[PDB]
């Protein structure tokens, strides 16, 4: 409803974004630390786009 294109591309990226965090949790990493580092990366990719 916001754009109209890319609705099967978001669920693939979100699903692959959660899988990559599975290994970080098993090493003793707080989930809030992961959710904090993710937002910093999304500010680098958008400013690069």
């Amino acid at each position: 409803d916001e754009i109209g294109d890319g609705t099967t591309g978001v669920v693939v990226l979100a699903g692959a974004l959660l899988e990559e965090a599975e290994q970080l949790l098993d090493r003793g990493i707080h989930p809030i630390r992961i959710a904090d580092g993710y937002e910093q990366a999304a500010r680098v990719a958008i400013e690069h786009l």
């Binding site: 409803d1 916001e2 707080h30 989930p31 809030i32 904090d36 937002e39």
Partner: protein
Amino acid sequence: TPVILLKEGTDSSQGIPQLVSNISACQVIAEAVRTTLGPRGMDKLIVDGRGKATISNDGATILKLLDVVHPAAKTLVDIAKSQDAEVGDGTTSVTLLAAEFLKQVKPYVEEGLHPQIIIRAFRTATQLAVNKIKEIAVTVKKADKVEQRKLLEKCAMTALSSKLISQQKAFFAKMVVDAVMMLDDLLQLKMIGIKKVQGGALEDSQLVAGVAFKKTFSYAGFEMQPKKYHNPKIALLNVELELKAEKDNAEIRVHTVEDYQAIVDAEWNILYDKLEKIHHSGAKVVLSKLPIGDVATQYFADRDMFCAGRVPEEDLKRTMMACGGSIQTSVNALSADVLGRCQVFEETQIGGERYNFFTGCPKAKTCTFILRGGAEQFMEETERSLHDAIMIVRRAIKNDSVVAGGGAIEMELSKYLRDYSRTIPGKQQLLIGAYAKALEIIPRQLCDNAGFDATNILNKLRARHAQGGTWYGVDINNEDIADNFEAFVWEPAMVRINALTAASEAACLIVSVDETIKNPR
């Protein structure tokens, strides 16, 4: 025996086992909301019997969503609603404090101590702790406009740091402060337009300086009239501008066909008389609670005039204190002083929805929040998080007194009570001393939620306070202690005063109960 006193099924218990089993029942309520405290807290997920999920980090709504039936535990759920009605913040800090006042006095109950001695001791400590906060509460002289804006930004930023929107706490804290100075004296909570629109990003939320409401039902011809005006004149009405019967209780008895045709022309002349009176007044935008028929829609399309109908009552009242008109139930008096005015009016598209905007009001005394998220539960958690900074700033104007946080004020109180207990003799030492050891539950939970060493840190805080650093709290980014007053972690003094009185009253009530009786059905 053959004739029995009470009904068959009246369960009854009493004694020492009755009271100890109540202390162990409040340990379950406090543990349901234990891990939602601090900047590193985690929210919960509850499901109803139908299948609707409610995802939240605040104590008040978590305890409302559990079907607690234990009579002793139902006191802890009732004090949470009291805290979110008086101050609106600190809800989950009175639940751990209420359970810690009962765990620390559990062994003394088993030894045979008269519970009246405990109640006298609890009331003596609360009055000595509430008075200590007011003695060391920091205030300022001549709070000027600049310094009175920084003070509320810091307080609103702290109430937001433990919520879902924690990365964008700087952006949001600037909108909440600006949204409360538009109000004048009573600071009504119904003058803020929380609206929720699906789609977008969390940084796309906007605050408007007027009113904004969704597009309502429209008839044929609605797309034939302009949707952008420069200086309109809002006509706030309460009338049905549609072709109908004059009165439900009416009857017409005509005799000749010449009078038949004049009746049909009389209904078309009544309606056209109302529309002409509106058009002569110079109005350009008209609104009405009652419906607007299609004949009136095509009347306003041929004269470049906007029309709307079936507006909710909560939205017309928000327009009035933003434009400056008045609701008219009759069109017989439309003067220049009963019309509204603004600077821009348009109808844009946001997230596949049509919204009307009324920005540009220099004398506006109301605002409206448009929230942009990505799911139904993303907006509800953002609205509940915004509802905490609203009430914190509202309470912070009537009381310009602040204290440091992050355990900095729990530890100064526990130091003052330990010194007081060593002077008075008797059994009051083991009761006041048990009150001081229960106030350090707040710093302990902050180091347990982040994953720290809760014992080594507390040994350092207890040494910095006994030397004489009054505002020395904890730090989660530095793995250490620091000065929380210079670190700009501030909170009003009214969130801790009401937290001790509510926690002390709930603990003193449970102790006094001797026996319980449950009746059948």
